[PDB]
Design a protein around this ligand. Structure first.
Ligand SMILES: [Mg+2]
Ligand SMILES: [Mg+2]
Lengths: 250, 308, 168, 245
RNA sequence: UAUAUAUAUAAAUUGAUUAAAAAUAAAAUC
């Protein structure tokens, strides 16, 4: 039996009571407000645990089940805070032992419902520099470095390319203070990883704007075939991108 | 593509590929998808709703059907084979931007692409549907990445009023410190866990007038001398940048900060490399999704038959 | 063990009448399947006059009682094809590649989901009654299926020999 | 030791410098006398072979001392993971054939026309030893794999290459020789796999693809350890070598 | 170099008197 079910919170929350007729409020909005907490004059929600990013290389992901739906905490002391019948946030009646009892992997699990999802580790900048020096300068092949550092070859090659771009930007100082701040912030939000054919180029006399290039090919294999299927007016219309990035019909 | 409408409605409670606060709450309160007391068709429909709200909301249904690949790829724990239902979308350029944390949404990444801020191997790509091959390197203009991962720049009026309030509270603090300095210092240490000149060093600030400061931002810049924001209106250190200029991470960023496996990211340069297509492995899937394997398999059975 | 690990799913829920002289008396039949998803499954049936809740209650106990181990190949599929006739239902079920869905009739879908059969493709011929489909499904799963180890031992052969050769 | 001594009846294993010197003198006399008498170097080898063989049997019981018991005895430390005991046992209870032949050639040229005392003591201590067959070499290769000693691996595949030249190897049939060489190649592949030198393992596989039939059962370790790092190129070439069939 | 800012008043469209919502939908701002 399927029913159009308004997505009310699974946890218990303080619902509406008798309301002024002109309030025009909904329970979902109250749940929103209780999840967030008071709104600062700056527009912030400091009371929430998720307003501010972490800074100790331990990602902070939503844990509504392990929190029983209580998502408010003191911004400084970081001790839990919960709503009260008085209407002012105050200390909980009892300790929530399950917030203390977090599995090692669940700390790295982004979404509660999907256990298989996990966040990759960020390589330390020193490790990136070490890989770049080992490959570019010493000459150790990507296989050797991957075996050395427990990494995959394509990741190693991507690291080399990115460190090349980083080197160029640092040479020109194209990096800005905002970019450095974002880099340092994001780096601290994630756990840190611990260690032939015949070709003829035709003659180009002066004033020619382009050069013919002839590639050898065999009859029965070269050409556009006659009676080929026309897919343009069909859903499987083939589309590609020219090297300029222009969309073309391939 | 689909015209965005009621994407973040709390009644519907569908999680979207976004860093928004409303999306955060919708993810928070959902718990898990309810597939119980439902026929097979109803289970498939619920799985479609939940999964298709996240993976490709913009894609048209009759377009997603054509894009959908009935044959998946997989390289003791159990392999989650059917989480790869939507792995085909992970090679699209906009999805790559969103997963690289170069945008706060797939739609925002789409606008970044369509507005010419994105390059793939050094050629400006203006088409969100461009598919990334393994080893491709794609980059975004750093200003747009900083805007995506930064707080909204306040208007002049909003930040001016915020400064008004900050002056009011700073004057309050120094007043109370002057009245009762010794225990003020001791109790401040109480949180941190006597020199009477301490309160003497602190200096008042003059309340500003909105009517007189309106429309004169260079004047307002000189008129503010708070200890923390010296000579700039709040959030507008350089008012010619697209973001909160004393660069501040956007609110509610920790919940959605997943580092993808298939991409290798360089935040300092706003570059990324597409290592591979996402592949399921024993006990882990590289398709970042908020739904469990049962939901994905129900969606997969739906799309195999096209709803039959 | 029983409550936390076993999952119960109703398969059949219906009203059956026994018209007595005074009037039409209506009772509630329920057929359920309980399986731990890890190689153990059972079916249960319940009949209650006053409310279906009691029918499902007794059905749950009966399913718990008949809970039996089910042969499984790689813990994801049947060992080989099963062609089975049960009281007018013809079940043709085929093992499948890893990653293959449960591309079967719905009743078989809940049975496989409960019993941990990840991979299967099947067709139901002749009568399509859900009752008979479920009963024959469990029967063909346990009687009509033989493990490769058991087959090899009965033939006095090593698993390396009995295993199929790869051709392409 | 008890079995080698026939329960203590034979006092061979216990030694003294007195016994060493006297036996060296005796075998000096015996061998330098026999050297001239033989017609040709081949016959002198035959006499030395007969002497050493009969000497081994009189020295210690033949039955308890053989390839099989020695294999188990040397296998004890490998499973128990002590290198020193294994090498001590291997040196005390084993001799390489090519080394013996070189020693006998040296003593042949010495008598016909401390190192000489060393060679006499060597021919004397042969009573304690059994020749290194292919199986024993493969066991020492397994020891190298278990202990991850590169020097031991290099020594053993040098000694196996030398042993290929000595006549006991060439006495065997061609298929047995090729099968044992394939086994040794597989052991080398395992060693270079576990050491993490994948390129050399792929090189060994590629060089001898035609001479040896490489099956996936042999290269499963290599294929796994390559897929862990995702070397799609090396995986592809290795799998093509295996499955070209 | 402080920072869980707090107090008041005023209003507050449709439906409804709470798990009944429309609705972050509008407007406004970047
Ligand atoms: Mg309906
Ligand atoms: Mg009204």
């Amino acid at each position: 039996f399927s029913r159009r079910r308004i997505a009310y919170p699974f946890y218990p929350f303080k619902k509406l009571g008798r309301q002024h007729p002109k309030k025009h409020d909904t329970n979902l909005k109250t749940a929103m407000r209780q999840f967030l907490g008071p709104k600062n004059y700056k527009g912030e929600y400091v009371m929430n645990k998720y307003f501010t990013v972490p800074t100790n290389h331990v990602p902070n992901y939503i844990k509504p089940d392990l929190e029983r739906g209580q998502s408010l905490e003191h911004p400084v002391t970081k001790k839990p805070l919960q709503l009260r019948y008085d209407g002012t946030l105050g200390p909980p009646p009892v300790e929530n032992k399950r917030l203390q009892n977090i599995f090692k992997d669940r700390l790295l699990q982004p979404f509660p419902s999907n256990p298989h999802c996990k966040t990759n580790y960020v390589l330390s900048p020193q490790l990136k520099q070490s890989i770049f020096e080992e490959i570019t300068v010493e000459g150790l092949s990507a296989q050797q470095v991957s075996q050395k550092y427990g990494l995959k070859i394509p990741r190693v090659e991507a690291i080399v390319k990115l460190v090349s771009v980083e080197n160029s930007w640092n040479r020109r100082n194209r990096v800005s203070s905002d970019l450095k701040t974002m880099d340092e912030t994001l780096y601290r939000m994630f756990p840190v990883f611990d260690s032939n054919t015949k070709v003829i180029y035709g003659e180009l006399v002066e004033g020619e704007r382009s050069q013919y290039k002839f590639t050898n090919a065999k009859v029965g294999k070269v050409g556009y075939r006659y009676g080929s299927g026309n897919r343009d007016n069909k859903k499987d219309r083939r589309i590609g991108f020219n090297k300029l990035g222009q969309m073309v019909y391939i | 593509p689909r015209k965005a409408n009621l994407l973040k409605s709390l009644a519907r409670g569908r999680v979207r590929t976004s860093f928004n606060k409303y999306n955060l709450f919708n993810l928070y309160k959902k718990g898990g998808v309810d597939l119980k007391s439902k026929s097979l068709y109803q289970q498939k429909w619920t799985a479609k709703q939940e999964t298709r709200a996240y993976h490709g909301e913009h894609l048209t249904e009759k377009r997603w059907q054509t894009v959908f690949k009935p044959k998946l790829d997989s390289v003791i724990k159990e392999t989650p084979f059917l989480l790869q239902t939507f792995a085909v979308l992970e090679k699209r350029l906009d999805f790559a931007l969103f997963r690289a944390m170069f945008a706060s949404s797939v739609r925002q990444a789409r606008q970044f692409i369509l507005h010419g801020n994105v390059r793939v191997n050094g050629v400006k790509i203006k088409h969100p549907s461009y598919t990334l091959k393994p080893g491709d390197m794609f980059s975004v203009k750093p200003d747009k990445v900083l805007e995506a991962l930064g707080a909204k720049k306040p208007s002049f009026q909003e930040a001016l009023k915020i400064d008004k309030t900050q002056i009011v509270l700073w004057n309050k603090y120094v007043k109370e410190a002057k009245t009762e300095p010794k225990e003020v210092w001791e109790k401040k240490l109480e949180n941190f866990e006597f020199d009477p000149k301490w309160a003497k060093n602190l200096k008042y600030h003059d309340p500003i007038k909105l009517s007189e400061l309106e429309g004169d931002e260079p004047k307002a810049r000189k008129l503010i001398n708070l200890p923390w924001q010296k000579n700039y209106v709040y959030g507008r250190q350089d008012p010619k940048k697209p973001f909160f200029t004393p660069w501040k991470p956007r609110p509610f960023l920790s919940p959605f900060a997943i580092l993808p496996h298939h991409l290798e990211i360089s935040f300092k340069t706003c570059h990324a490399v597409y290592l591979r297509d996402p592949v399921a492995r024993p006990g882990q899937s590289e398709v970042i999704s908020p739904f469990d394997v049962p939901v994905h398999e129900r969606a997969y059975m739906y799309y195999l038959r096209n709803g039959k | 063990y029983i409550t936390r690990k076993l999952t119960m799913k109703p398969l059949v829920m219906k009203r059956v009448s026994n018209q007595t002289g005074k009037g039409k008396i209506a009772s509630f039949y329920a057929l359920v399947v309980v399986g731990d998803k890890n190689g153990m499954v059972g079916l249960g049936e319940g009949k209650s006059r006053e409310e279906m809740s009691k029918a499902i209650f007794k059905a749950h106990w009966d399913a718990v009682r008949n809970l039996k181990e089910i042969p499984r190949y790689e813990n994801r599929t049947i060992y080989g094809d099963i062609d089975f006739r049960y009281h007018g239902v013809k079940l043709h079920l085929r093992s499948a590649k890893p990653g293959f869905g449960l591309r079967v009739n719905h009743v078989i879908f809940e049975i496989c989901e409960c019993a941990g059969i990840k991979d299967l493709s099947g067709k139901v011929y002749k009568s399509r009654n859900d009752m008979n489909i479920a009963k024959g499904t469990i029967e063909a799963f346990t009687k009509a299926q033989k493990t490769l180890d058991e087959v090899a031992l009965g033939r006095g052969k090593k698993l390396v020999d009995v295993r199929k050769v790869y051709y392409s | 030791s008890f079995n080698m001594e026939n329960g203590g009846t034979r006092n061979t294993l216990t030694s003294s410098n007195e016994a060493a010197l006297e036996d060296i003198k005796k075998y000096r006399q015996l061998l330098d006398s026999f050297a001239q008498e033989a017609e040709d170097f081949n016959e002198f080898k035959f006499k030395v072979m007969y002497e050493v063989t009969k000497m081994q049997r009189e020295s210690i019981n033949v039955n308890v001392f053989n390839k099989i018991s020695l294999h188990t005895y040397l296998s004890i430390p490998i499973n128990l993971k002590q290198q020193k005991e294994f090498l001590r046992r291997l040196t005390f209870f084993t001799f390489q054939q090519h080394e013996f032949e070189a020693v006998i050639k040296r003593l042949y040229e010495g008598y016909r026309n401390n190192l000489i005392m060393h060679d006499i003591w060597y021919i004397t201590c042969l009573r304690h030893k059994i020749m290194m067959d292919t199986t024993l070499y493969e066991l020492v290769m397994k020891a190298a794999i278990e202990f991850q000693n590169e020097d031991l691996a290099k020594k053993v595949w040098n000694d196996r290459g030398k042993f290929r030249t000595t006549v006991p190897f060439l006495k065997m049939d061609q298929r047995i020789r090729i099968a044992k060489d394939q086994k040794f190649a597989h052991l080398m592949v395992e060693f270079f796999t576990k050491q993490g030198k994948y390129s050399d393992a792929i090189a060994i596989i590629l060089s001898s693809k035609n001479r040896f039939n490489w099956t996936y059962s042999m290269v499963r370790n290599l294929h796994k350890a390559l897929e862990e790092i995702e070397d799609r190129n090396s995986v592809e070439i290795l799998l093509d070598v295996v499955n070209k069939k």
